[PDB]
Amino acid sequence: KSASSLLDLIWLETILPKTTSFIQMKMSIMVSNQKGLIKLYFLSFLITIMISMTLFNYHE
Amino acid sequence: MPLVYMNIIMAFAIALAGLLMYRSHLMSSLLCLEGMMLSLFIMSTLIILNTHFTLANMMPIILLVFAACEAALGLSLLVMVSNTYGTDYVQNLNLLQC
Amino acid sequence: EPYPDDGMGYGDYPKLPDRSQQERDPWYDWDHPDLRLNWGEPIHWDLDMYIRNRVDTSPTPV
Amino acid sequence: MLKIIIPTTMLLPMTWMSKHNMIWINATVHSLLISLISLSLLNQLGENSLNFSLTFFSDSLSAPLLVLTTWLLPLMLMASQSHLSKETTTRKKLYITMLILLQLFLIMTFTATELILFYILFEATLVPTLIIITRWGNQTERLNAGLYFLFYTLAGSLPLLVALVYIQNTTGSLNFLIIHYWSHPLSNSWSNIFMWLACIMAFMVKMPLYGLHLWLPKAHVEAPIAGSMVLAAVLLKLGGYGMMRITTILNPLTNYMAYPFLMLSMWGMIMTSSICLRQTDLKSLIAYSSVSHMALVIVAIMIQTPWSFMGATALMIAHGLTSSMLFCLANTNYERVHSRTMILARGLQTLLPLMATWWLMASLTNLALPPSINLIGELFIITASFSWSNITIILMGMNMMITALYSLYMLITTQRGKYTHHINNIKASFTRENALMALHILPLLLLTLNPKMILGPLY
Amino acid sequence: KTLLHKYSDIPEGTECHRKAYASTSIGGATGLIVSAYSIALKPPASFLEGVARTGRYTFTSAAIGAIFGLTSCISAQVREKPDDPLNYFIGGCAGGLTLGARTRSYGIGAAACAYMGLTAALVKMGQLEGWQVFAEPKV
Amino acid sequence: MNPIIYTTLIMTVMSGTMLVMISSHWLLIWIGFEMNLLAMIPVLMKNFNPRATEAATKYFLTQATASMMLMMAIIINLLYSGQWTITKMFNPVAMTMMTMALAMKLGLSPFHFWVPEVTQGISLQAGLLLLTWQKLAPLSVLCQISQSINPNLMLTMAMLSILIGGWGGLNQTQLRKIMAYSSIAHMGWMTAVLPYNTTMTILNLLIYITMTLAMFMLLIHSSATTTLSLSHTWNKMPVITSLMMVTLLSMGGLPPLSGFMPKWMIIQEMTKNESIIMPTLMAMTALLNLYFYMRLAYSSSLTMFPSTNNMKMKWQFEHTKQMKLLPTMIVLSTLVLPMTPALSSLN
Amino acid sequence: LQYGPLAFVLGERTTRKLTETSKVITVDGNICSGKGRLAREIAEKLGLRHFPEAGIHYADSTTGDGKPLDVQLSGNCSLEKFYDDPKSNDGNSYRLQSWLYASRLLQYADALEHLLSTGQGVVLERSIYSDFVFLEAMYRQGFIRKQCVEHYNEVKKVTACEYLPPHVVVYVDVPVPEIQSRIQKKGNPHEMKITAAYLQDIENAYKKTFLPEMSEKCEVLQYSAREAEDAEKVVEDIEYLKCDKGPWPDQDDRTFHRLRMLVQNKLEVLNYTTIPVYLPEITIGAHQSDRVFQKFTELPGRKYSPGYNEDVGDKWIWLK
Amino acid sequence: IRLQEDPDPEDENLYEKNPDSHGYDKDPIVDLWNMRVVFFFGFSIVLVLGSTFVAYLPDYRMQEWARREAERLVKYREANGLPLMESNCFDPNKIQLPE
Amino acid sequence: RQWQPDVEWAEQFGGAVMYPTKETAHWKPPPWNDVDPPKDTLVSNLTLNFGLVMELSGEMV
Ligand SMILES: CCCCCCCCCCCCCCCCCC(=O)OC[C@H](COP(=O)(O)OCCN)OC(=O)CCCCCCCCCCCCCCCCC
Ligand SMILES: CCCCCCCCCCCCCCCCCC(=O)OC[C@H](COP(=O)(O)OCCN)OC(=O)CCCCCCCCCCCCCCCCC
Ligand SMILES: CCCCCCCCCCCCCCCCCC(=O)O[C@@H](COC(=O)CCCCCCCCCCCCCCC)COP(=O)(O)OC[C@H](O)CO
Ligand SMILES: Nc1nc2c(ncn2[C@@H]2O[C@H](COP(=O)(O)OP(=O)(O)OP(=O)(O)O)[C@@H](O)[C@H]2O)c(=O)[nH]1
Structure with missing residues (x-):
């Protein structure tokens, strides 16, 4: 119940390896679901332009 | 930096914002694409004409001859999507979802 | 009846009574006489603990 | 070495162009013969490590491993040749190619004189093994097992690569000799703490250490027998060889x-x-x-x-x-x-x-x-x-x-x-x-x- | 980096009210950035739904910063040690608890404490020893 | 497309990009970019399918404005400096405009959104030109002006490139889409050291181009576009799948394969500049690239997916394309690691 | 070279060599109606290269020596097995139709390549745009299931769209009771056991679904049994028809360059036949497929590339 | 049916064909040579001859030399009346301690 | 024999998204020939009124 199960095969596998897989996966579904509308793409360009020029103080 | 220079670059800035703020018409975006090269032409001309950079008068025309060349292909691109979709509406310009 | 759903991952495995293989009728025919086990009978989740040469739950007189 | 590495490499074209059925025979012949040659390195001098060239050297720790790996090579051949006798000639030749290549990396890794050269081949052993566990495995969990083995080893090895090149820029050369004779006191500091952690975690994962070890029950069990040995008999010790060499500089921070x-x-x-x-x-x-x-x-x-x-x-x-x-x-x-x-x-x-x-x-x-x-x-x-x-x-x-x-x-x-x-x-x-x-x-x-x-x- | 200077200028273990309000601003500022992107790539419903999405994203980000700044500073006061990296860990991961509170998931809250606390501790090391992430080209 | 017209149109793109790397005038740099843009659109529209028009429209709409934005910082730099020579920019906001304009011609930051679909829509051969030849012209400008770019802006955009590129590849099916996300991840890799050292950016370029061009236009030899379609190729040409895995493993960068050439050299330079957190996270997310690299190799050669009975027909025939320069290109993209001192030659 | 881009650049036009005798006529009639006989006679009368209807081993005919290979090694489906057990779970029914349709793709590509490289006409028996009516007929009879229909339609849409229709199709109508009589005069025992229901199912969808829509892009001249025997007359009608439909009236060298480039690549013309759509009737598993391929590669002449198999006796193998 | 695959054929009894089968491959004659090579190129020359080579190697990591260097150092040191081995490792006279 | 991928293993990779969700639950995979299905053609032969009605294909009638 412990040792072989719980700690191993459940816990030690769900803390380091699988959680990193889940973290890499939850937003993988996101960053690969762009709706394909040109309006949304160029609107994200506006923000990326706006935040970089002055809001992040990237000029200086 | 005088006011006449400011009004042009600011016009470019608002032209840039409207270009990437696609409404439900590709022609309007193409029209708003038309803004900057004219703003670029105007902005370039005041700089070059003011500073008496005689040879640099090249570039204003050089700017226009090719910056209009995309408009040559862009309009045909617009009529191409309007020959299969029958509409310049950009909401249907998303067939490349997957 | 399956094991209690404590989240331990036991699944739908049957909760056979905690009774060692030592508590088997020796004279009854067994397909695995060294384990007193037949064929296809769903074996205990902890068979390798209640096996003949391990923990035995046979009733002591006292 | 050149006297063991070259014969090892030369087994590769030999097995490929060998006779149709004599592949198992000839490969077993010379792999045993190469192991006999590697028995020569079991001798070590008084204290100075046995040095042959700038890139290759041996000591009283690498050579006992070198003979073990080259002696192992015949053993995987005979053990695996049972089930492998039921597929195409190219497939069987590809396997013997891969064990020969896998052994080749191990021999060159254990005698590497530059720590960067050590790391390159130490991680390079993944490719021959990874394909062994996946392609020729005899189960279904091998597909997940191969990913677990590759990612665990790589996730620890990559900090080592960043840490290793850091020593190159700061201290200078990373030769196993110049590192030893120019050991400096790695004082306790948070930057040194992560320096210590990076140079150690890479070898710990391949030990494996308790907790960073779940790749082993998946990799070893699902792997074919020609592999099931090496993932347990040599390359775990490869992580061991890394520890005993890299800890030359990690003092006195190691005890803390x-x-x-x-x-x-x-x-x-x-x-x-x-x-x-x-x-x-x-x-x-x-x-x-x-x-x-x-x-x-x-x-x-x-x-x-x-x-x-x-x-x-x-x-x-x-x-x-x-x-x-x-x-x-x-x-x-x-x-x-x-x-x-x-x-x-x-x-x-x-x-x-x-x-x-x-x-x-x-x-x-x-x-x-x-x-x-x-x-x-x-x-x-x-x-x-x-x-x-x-x-x-x-x-x-x-x-x-x-x-x-x-x-x-x-x-x-x-x-x-x-x-x-x-x-x-x-x-x-x-x-x-x-x-x-x-x-x-x-x-x-x-x-x-x-x-x-x-x-x-x-x- | 006016907001970044606003936070880092306040000495550790003092002016906790200023440190908290600075933490809210930094947490608030990143709230607008993520929400504005979310509205852009994913078109919401009518504007009231859009601001509802914007409000939620800003609220969590501000809340994560708010509690983190509070506990990261009072810990130095109470424990009488500002230099320790743990002084950021104990509050750095509590933001993960706050994220779990607004998302209603024990697993995501606990895992976020595992990660955010480590990163928050790492940030303290970065300021202490002299770490640089965007280092200028030196060689 | 009449072959004579097709050859001329590629030559113009050949000429347009070549003009950028040989120009000393800011206008002439913008001059070839517009010609290069003007010539690719018909090349992309090779099949005239509605998807191809979608890809061409997206590519034009994201590149023409970049050339327009390109001209904007040119005059502003002209306004504050008065010289068109390709040199350091003497006004900060112009170069802040410049880096974003050049990058969104390329796509590393959220600017990158056009790369995935546009690659998918166009043909496989057309996808090659966009992804192995269009990355030199913007990099040519960035190499020349690398002296004074803001390190904060460039590295952030490089981080986002490899982070977004690797993450999106995991959830992709069409091999064209994995190609775009793989390219996005690698472009951040090559441009991350761009402010620090320029030689190892060009190192990554030649290294990345060789493997990408080889494995793109080898995929053309397989005549497949989906993971399942690529999976079937083991029965027909198992050598192709075996070669597919070698470059795929090289694509990830596992030593001693030559795909580890850039990743190694990049970490060396960033470490030399005291930037050490930057490479480690940069190296970490490279595992995401390997995962879908490894997944594709799983379905290609490492296992055997089910085939189809009608495919027995293909065994009686053979390919007709002469795979121009293909066979040598795998060799120098998976085995050239021992030739590492060749870095000094690029300087 | 084999009409590369250099060839067309240097002057290898296609419309230059086309003459009015360049025809892609097909003779497609009912089952056992002697349409093949009429197709052969038309080829003899005109300058048309006769292409008898492709079978299971037509691909074998065009490859190697033309010797038919093992049925399992060359299709895995046999026509007579479908006759005896049309409802067998082995899927020999749909596999027979699907492989035959792929054989039709090769037949069309060979006809188009010869037509566009020599200018000679071609007469076909049951061209590409014919197999779909039997698939529908076999579907309604119940020999195959619905999922066979959608898959086959998927092949038709993906592949046949890349090709172009015939000039004027020749149709032969012979009544089903006479066809059921015509099967008996043959005497091949697998050919008696076929029901009149499937024969009827062939004919009704024929006149409802092949003649009507092909008529739009290619005229149809019906020839019943009495005029199916007539062959001198039928040539006159096809000569008195200008083919004002399809793309032939507006076909140029540019599209012909693309058409020959794709057709010459025999792999490409059926590259889209092996869609990863997994059907129980068509999906050969990994172990079975691998074992058959080993059988294929061990065969003579196929171990290496054509002209490079030293087993057959290709000399100079070290210098080619 | 779903899939068209041949099942697991069998586990070929290698002993059945040749009763003296050796367990290396199908073909007897090469298989007979297979022990003749693994035994000869194994036990004989890398195990027996291998052992004699390593066991009789020239002395490894000189000890009997170090054992030798003991007696004259101790004999010299004890005979003239000097402690047989000094507490300090390196000579301390030339050491320049800080301040 | 060693385990080999079956049809149920291929369906995992066969979808338009490797790891599907509620958003991708209806995303149809792209057509295999990459030629998307042509929708209804948008051509309108304007029935001209004269005075005789006219049905034109472009300019010519
Ligand atoms: C010492 C100085 C600083 C002191 C203060 C501490 C730092 C500031 C506060 C913490 C900032 C980092 C923590 C995350 C903040 C944003 C959280 C957020 O947006 O949560 C909402 C949402 C989570 O849920 P969601 O994924 O949308 O799924 C459910 C949908 N119904 O998530 C989203 O909608 C967005 C997607 C997930 C999050 C993406 C990453 C956001 C953070 C990026 C790094 C920010 C670093 C800030 C600090 C350093 C720079 C100043
Ligand atoms: C660094 C890490 C490792 C990297 C490489 C790893 C490679 C294998 C990885 C696994 C790949 C997936 C699983 C196996 C896939 C097999 C692919 C394949 O096509 O297999 C079947 C095929 C059949 O063979 P066939 O194509 O007919 O060619 C026979 C030789 N003419 O087989 C083949 O096509 C194989 C053909 C092999 C040809 C070998 C040629 C040898 C030449 C030797 C020259 C010797 C010169 C000696 C000179 C001496 C003096 C100096
Ligand atoms: C998968 C998660 C990680 C698994 C475990 C890996 C090992 C644990 C440690 C992680 C950090 C490894 C990276 C080490 C880089 C080289 C270390 C070294 O040589 O020490 C330097 C210290 O290294 C660092 O500063 C960086 C390492 C510390 C941790 C921060 C980055 C790593 C953690 C985030 C990325 C990895 C985690 C995964 C993310 C998805 C010394 O330089 P310095 O700081 O003194 O520089 C001079 C001056 O003082 C200022 O620079
Ligand atoms: N599945 C399938 N079977 C076909 C097709 N064309 C012909 N067959 C079969 O071919 C077999 C033999 O040819 P028949 O149909 O008897 O005759 P035919 O060659 O069509 O015409 P005749 O030459 O007049 O006899 C029959 O069992 C047909 O069902 C086709 O397109 N698909």
Whole structure:
């Protein structure tokens, strides 16, 4: 119940390896679901332009 | 930096914002694409004409001859999507979802 | 009846009574006489603990 | 080296252009011959490491591993040649190509003189192994197992690459000699703390350490036998070779930081051997057994005392030859019954008499009786660990008591019992199997006479 | 980096009200950035739904910063040790608890404490020893 | 497309990009970019399918404005400096405009959104030109002006490139889409050291181009576009799948394969500049690239996916394309690691 | 070279060599109606290269020596097995139709390549745009299931769209009772056991679904049994027809360059036939497929590339 | 049916064809040579001849030399009445301690 | 024999998204020939009124 199960095969596998897989996966579904509308793409360009020029103080 | 220079670059800035703020018409975006090269032409001309950079008068025309060349292909691109979709509406310009 | 759903991952495995293989009728025919086990009978989740040469739950007189 | 590396490389075109059926013959011929040549490096001079060229050098630690790897190469050939005899000539030739290439990297890695050159080939061993476990595996979980093995090793190795090049820019050259003679005190500081963690985690994952070890039960069990040996018999020690070399610079920060690793290995080795006390797959039984032995090597390195380093190499070599043996043993049954469950094939001494005897000495070597090299390694660590702390003998011996139960457990469950009634396909053991098993245990008991050769670089 | 200077200028273990309000601003500022992107790539419903999405994203980000700044500073006062990296860990991961509180998931809250606390501790090391992430080209 | 017209149109793109690397005038740099843009659109519209028009429209709409934005910082730099020479920019906001304009011509930051679909829509051969020849012209400008770019802006955009590129590849099916996300991840790799050292950016370029061009236009030899379609190729040409895995493993960068050439050299330079957190996270997310690299190799050669009975027909025939320069290109993209001192030659 | 881009650049036009005798006529009639006989006679009368209807081993005919290979090694489906057990779970029914349709793709590509490389006409028996009516007929009879229909339609949409229709199709109508009589005069035992229901199912969807829509892009001249025997007359009608439909009236060298480039690549013309759509009738598993391929590669002449198999006796193998 | 695959054929009894089968491959004659090569190129020359080479190697990591260097150092040191081995490792006279 | 991928293993990779969700639950995979299905053609022969009605294809009638 412990040792072989719980700690191993459940816990030690769900803390380091699988959680990193889940973290890499939850937003993988996101960053690969762009709706394909040109309006949304160029609107994200506006923000990326706006935040970089002055809001992040990237000029200086 | 005088006011006449400011009004042009600011016009470019608002032209840039409207270009990437696609409404439900590709022609309007193409029209708003038309803004900057004219703003670029105007902005370039005041700089070059003011500073008496005689040879640099090249570039204003050089700017226009090719910056209009995309408009040559862009309009045909617009009529191409309007020959299969029958509409310049950009909401249907998303067939490349997957 | 399956094991209690404590989240331990036991699944739908049957909760056979905690009774060692030592508590088997020796004279009854067994397909695995060294384990007193037949064929296809769903074996205990902890068979390798209640096996003949391990923990035995046979009733002591006292 | 050039005198071992070149013959190893030249086996590659030889096997490819060899005769249709003579591939197994010729490859076995010269791989044994190359191992004989590698016996020449077992000699070491007084204190200076045996140096041949700028890029290649050997010491009293690399050479005992070099002979082990080249001696292993014939063994995987014969063990795997049973089932591989039922596919295309190119497929079989591709396998022998891959073992030859895999061995080639191991020989060049162990004698690498530059730490960067060491890391390049140390991680390069992944590619030959990864394809072995995946392509020629005989299960379905191999697909997930290969990913687990590759990603665990790589996720730890990458910080090492960043850490290694940092030493190059700051200190200068990373030659294993110039590093030793120009050791500077790595003072305690948060940047040095992560410097210590990066240079150590890469080798810890490949040990594996308790917690960073779940790739082993998946990789080793699902891997083919030609692989199932090397992932347990040589390249785990490759992580060991990395530790004993990289810790030349990590002083005195190691003693302040070693505590989480020591407790994880020293306490986890009891838990890992407890898994072996209740297991269902024979391959998994030996796999978790390897973790317990390697965990004992993990703690052994970190005291950084003369006795610990000797017992480290002694157990490191002995376990590899041992754990390789048990995988051959599990292979023989797995071919006859076509399953890995322990209780399915109870009773083998009744049907196979000598197989029980080989199983007896195999389970005895893991039991580590005196004067077997396993015992001569574990005993040295116990004394070194006891000098470090008197309490650890409770944990150190507990495994020694626990390891007796499971090491004899498959002996009782498989051999010593009534033969299973329904099974009827057990055949008299082929003379290949018995000859292979003798090739494993005869050097081990012969090595008992002269432990000085394998005792390490501090004898 | 006016907001970044606003936070880092306040000495550790003092002016906790200023440190908290600076923490809210930094947490608030990143709230607008993520929400504005979310509205852009994913078109919401009518504007009231859009600001509802914007409000939620900003609220969590501000809340994570708010409690983190509070506990990261009072810990230095109470424990009388500002230099320790743990002084950021104990509050750095509590933001993960706050994220779990607004998302209603024990697993995601606990895992976020595992990660955010480590990163928050790492940030303290970065300021202490002299770590640089965007280092200028030196060689 | 009449072959004579097709050859001329590629030559113009050949000429347009070549003009950028040989120009010393800011206008002439913008001059070839517009010609290069003007010539690719017909090349992309090779099949005239509605998807191809979608890809061409997206590519034009994201590149023409970048050339327009390109001209904007040119005059502003002209306004504050008065010289068109390709040199350091003497006005900060112009170069802040410049880096974004050049990058979104390329796509590393959220600017990258056009790369995935546009690659998918166009043909496989057309996808090659966009992804192995269009990355030199913007990099040519960035190499020349690398002296004074803001390190904060460039590295952030490089981080986002490899982080977004690797993450999106995991959830992709069409081999064209994995190609775009793999390219996005690698472009951040090559441009991360761009402010620090320029030689190892060009190192990554030649290294990345060789493997990408080889494995793109080898995929053309397989005549497949989906993971399942690529999976079937083991039965027809198992050598192709075997070669597919070698470059795929090289694509990830596992030593001693030559795909580890850039990743190694990049970490060396960033470490030399005291930037050490930057490479480690940069190296970490490279595992995401390997995962879908490894997944594709799983379905290609490492296992055997089910085939189809009608595919027995293909065994009786053979390919007709002469795989121009293909065979040598795998060799120098998976085995050239021992030739590492060749870095000095690029300087 | 084999009409590469260099060839068309240097002057290898296609419309230059086309003459009015360049026709892609097909003779497609009912089952056992002697349409093959009429197709052969038309070829003899005109300058048309006759292409008899492709079978299971037509691919074998065009490859190697033309010797038919093992049925399992060359299709895995046999026509007579479908006759005896049309409802067998082995899927020999749909596999027979699907492989035959792929054989039709090769037949069309060979006809188009010869037509566009020599200018000679071609007469076909049951061209590409014919197999779909039997698939529908076999579907309604119940020999195959619905999922066979959608898959086959998927092949038709993906592949046949890339090709172009015939000039004027020749149709032969012979009544089903006479066809059921015509099967008996043959005497091949697998050919008697076929029911009149399937024969009827062939004919009704024929006149409802092949003649109507092909008529739009290619005229149809019906020839019943009495005029199916007539062959001198039928040539006159096809000569008195200008083919004002399809793309032939507006076909140029540019599209012909693309058409020959794709057709010459025999792999490409059926590259889209092996869609990863997995059907129980068509999906050969990994072990079975691998074993058959080993059988294929061990065969003579196929071990290496054509002209490079030293087993057959290709000399100079070290210098080619 | 779903899939068209041949099942697991069998586990070929290698002993059945040749009763003296050796367990290396199908073909007897090469298989007979297979022990003749693994035994000859194994036990004979890398195990027996291998052992004699390593066991009789020229002395490894000189000890009997170091054992030799003991007696004259101790004999010299004890005979003239000087402690047989000094506490300090390196000469301390030339050591310049800080301040 | 060693385990080999079956049809149920291929369906995992066969979808338009490797790891599907509620958003991708209806995303149809792209057509295999990459030619998306042509929708209804948008051509309108304006019935000209004269005075005789006229049905034109472009300019010519
Ligand atoms: C010492 C100085 C600083 C002191 C203060 C501490 C730092 C500031 C506060 C913490 C900032 C980092 C923590 C995350 C903040 C944003 C959280 C957020 O947006 O949560 C909402 C949402 C989570 O849920 P969601 O994924 O949308 O799924 C459910 C949908 N119904 O998530 C989203 O909608 C967005 C997607 C997930 C999050 C993406 C990453 C956001 C953070 C990026 C790094 C910010 C670093 C800031 C600090 C350093 C720079 C100043
Ligand atoms: C660095 C890490 C490792 C990187 C490489 C790893 C490679 C394998 C990785 C796994 C790949 C997936 C699993 C196996 C896939 C097999 C692919 C394949 O096509 O297999 C079947 C095929 C059949 O063989 P066939 O194509 O007919 O060619 C026979 C030789 N003419 O087989 C083949 O096509 C194979 C053909 C092999 C040809 C070998 C040629 C040898 C030449 C030797 C020259 C010797 C010169 C000696 C000179 C001496 C003096 C100096
Ligand atoms: C998968 C998660 C990680 C698994 C475990 C990996 C090992 C744990 C440690 C992680 C960090 C490894 C990277 C080490 C880089 C080289 C270390 C070294 O040589 O020490 C330097 C210290 O290294 C660092 O500063 C960086 C390492 C510390 C941790 C921060 C980055 C790593 C953690 C985040 C990325 C990895 C985690 C995964 C993310 C998805 C010394 O330089 P310095 O700081 O003194 O520089 C001079 C001056 O003082 C200022 O620079
Ligand atoms: N599945 C399938 N079977 C076909 C096709 N064309 C012909 N067959 C079969 O071919 C077999 C033999 O040819 P028949 O149909 O008897 O005759 P035919 O060649 O069409 O015409 P005749 O030459 O007049 O006899 C029959 O069993 C047909 O069903 C086709 O397109 N698909």
